[PDB]
Scaffold this active site. Structure first.
Site, PDB file in Angstrom:
ATOM      1  N   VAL A   9      69.236 -11.782   6.352  1.00  0.00           N
ATOM      2  CA  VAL A   9      69.348 -10.794   5.361  1.00  0.00           C
ATOM      3  C   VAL A   9      68.243  -9.842   5.356  1.00  0.00           C
ATOM      4  CG1 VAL A   9      69.712 -10.407   2.937  1.00  0.00           C
ATOM      5  CG2 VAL A   9      71.036 -12.121   4.293  1.00  0.00           C
ATOM      6  N   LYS A  58      72.310  -3.003   0.456  1.00  0.00           N
ATOM      7  CA  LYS A  58      73.726  -2.972   0.223  1.00  0.00           C
ATOM      8  C   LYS A  58      74.164  -3.806  -1.040  1.00  0.00           C
ATOM      9  CE  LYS A  58      74.404  -1.465   4.678  1.00  0.00           C
ATOM     10  NZ  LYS A  58      73.760  -0.287   5.276  1.00  0.00           N
ATOM     11  N   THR A  85      96.349  -0.710  14.878  1.00  0.00           N
ATOM     12  CA  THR A  85      96.011  -2.016  15.266  1.00  0.00           C
ATOM     13  C   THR A  85      97.104  -3.054  15.088  1.00  0.00           C
ATOM     14  OG1 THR A  85      93.828  -2.463  16.136  1.00  0.00           O
ATOM     15  CG2 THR A  85      94.244  -3.665  14.245  1.00  0.00           C
ATOM     16  N   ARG A 126     107.847 -12.659   8.107  1.00  0.00           N
ATOM     17  CA  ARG A 126     107.588 -14.103   8.215  1.00  0.00           C
ATOM     18  C   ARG A 126     108.804 -14.816   8.697  1.00  0.00           C
ATOM     19  NH1 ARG A 126     102.769 -16.291   8.511  1.00  0.00           N
ATOM     20  NH2 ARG A 126     103.786 -18.233   7.745  1.00  0.00           N
ATOM     21  N   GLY A 155     104.607 -17.602  10.845  1.00  0.00           N
ATOM     22  CA  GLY A 155     104.399 -16.300  11.466  1.00  0.00           C
ATOM     23  C   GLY A 155     105.073 -16.228  12.850  1.00  0.00           C
ATOM     24  N   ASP A 156     105.140 -17.337  13.534  1.00  0.00           N
ATOM     25  CA  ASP A 156     105.772 -17.241  14.806  1.00  0.00           C
ATOM     26  C   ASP A 156     106.144 -18.615  15.260  1.00  0.00           C
ATOM     27  OD1 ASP A 156     103.246 -18.320  15.324  1.00  0.00           O
ATOM     28  OD2 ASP A 156     102.670 -16.633  16.716  1.00  0.00           O
TER      29      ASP A 156
HETATM   30 MN   LIG Z   1     100.479 -17.957  18.222  1.00  0.00          MN
HETATM   31 MN   LIG Z   2      97.801  -5.182  17.303  1.00  0.00          MN
HETATM   32 MN   LIG Z   3      64.780 -13.163   5.424  1.00  0.00          MN
END
Ligand SMILES: [Mn+2]
Ligand SMILES: [Mn+2]
Ligand SMILES: [Mn+2]
Length: 327
Positions: free
Chosen positions: A57, A64, A93, A141, A181-182
């Site tokens: 840290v 932050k 993505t 799903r 999921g699969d």
């Molecule tokens: Mn998989």
């Molecule tokens: Mn992807």
């Molecule tokens: Mn430290």
DNA sequence: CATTAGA
DNA sequence: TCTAATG
């Protein structure tokens, strides 16, 4: 788990961003160890100062934390959340085949949306092509109900091609989950283990099977040991077709099934924990075997397995039905 | 953490 | 060969 939440989540947001929109491997790595330690600490961080005492840290993140603690938010966080480019990257993505590298490039080219990608189907590869194809059903799903249906047919031809096969459909499904999921198909065959120099066909024969019958519909990737695909359940007597499903079949040396079985069946925690115990119990477990420990520090020598039981008996535990392998 | 594509 | 993307 909750007294340190806001901080953890904020950080990981912070971290996930560096990695993706930016290339900041390190910063990202940074936010992660921190976001990790801060999670462990048993008390309410009340000021950065306090956080800062921590390992990993620094001045950076502590600064932050004050801001987050002080005001219910963070600008940097607020700015990113707004940033179209970066948004853009997070989005693309989701497209199975798409990674950060692509994401970025795509964006730079100006491909930012679903449609963008369409218009340029050319710019994408087969995976990505497919991914784009089934984006909607890929994010959907899979109901156990279906899971049941899927596993059925699958064992079906498995059986048909050669009766000497062994398939297990691992994962949360295996674990009872109301949804998945699969689908994860583990596979082995006596005629294939450790040394017995392959039989690629072994894998080969099945996919082909599944295809011939229409279970398999596309190929994401086919290797001599790991197939990765797309499947669908025969759309019944009309009015209702099925969503395109992500499926994975893998070959395995009959000599390492159960561990891998054990393992991929989870849960992440169940595993970790069982494994932790095998340490005391004078053992070592990993995705393929179970070795007894030698006090010299470490050891080797793969104990023989024939069932999920052997691994258990070994570490002298309670057979846990996969039902309750939850943790 | 290893397998696959790909360029 | 490397590098990306999956799990
Ligand atoms: Mn998989
Ligand atoms: Mn992807
Ligand atoms: Mn430290």
């Amino acid at each position: 788990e909750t007294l340190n939440g806001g901080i953890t989540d904020m950080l990981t947001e912070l971290a996930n961003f560096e990695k993706n929109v930016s290339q900041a491997i390190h910063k990202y790595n940074a936010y992660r160890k921190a976001a990790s330690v801060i999670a462990k600490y048993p008390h309410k961080i009340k000021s950065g100062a306090e956080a800062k005492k921590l390992p990993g840290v620094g001045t950076k993140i502590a600064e932050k934390i004050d801001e987050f603690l002080a005001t219910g938010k963070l600008r940097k966080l607020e700015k990113i959340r707004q940033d179209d480019t970066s948004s853009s990257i997070n989005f693309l993505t989701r497209v199975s085949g798409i990674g950060p590298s692509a994401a970025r490039k795509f964006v730079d080219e100006g491909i930012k949306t679903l449609e963008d990608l369409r218009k340029n189907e050319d710019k994408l590869n087969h995976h990505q092509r497919i991914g784009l194809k089934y984006f909607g059903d890929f994010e959907k799903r899979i109901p156990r109900e279906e899971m049941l249906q899927m596993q059925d047919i699958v064992l079906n031809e498995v059986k048909k091609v050669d009766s000497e096969y062994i398939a297990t459909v691992c994962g949360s499904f295996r674990r009872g989950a109301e949804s998945s999921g699969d689908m994860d198909v583990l596979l082995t065959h006596p005629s294939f283990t450790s040394e017995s120099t392959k039989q690629p066909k072994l894998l080969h024969q099945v996919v082909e099977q599944l295809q011939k019958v229409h279970f398999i519909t596309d190929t994401l990737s086919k290797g001599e040991t790991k197939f990765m695909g797309v499947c669908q359940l025969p759309s019944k007597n009309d009015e209702k077709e099925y969503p395109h499903r992500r499926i994975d079949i893998r070959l395995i040396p009959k000599d390492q099934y159960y561990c891998g079985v054990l393992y991929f069946t989870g849960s992440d925690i169940f595993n970790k924990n069982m494994r932790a115990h095998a340490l005391e119990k004078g053992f070592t477990i990993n995705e393929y075997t179970i070795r007894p420990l030698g006090v010299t520090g470490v050891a080797g020598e793969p104990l023989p397995v024939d069932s999920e039981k052997d691994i258990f008996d070994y570490i002298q535990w309670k057979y846990r039905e996969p039902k309750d392998r939850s943790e």
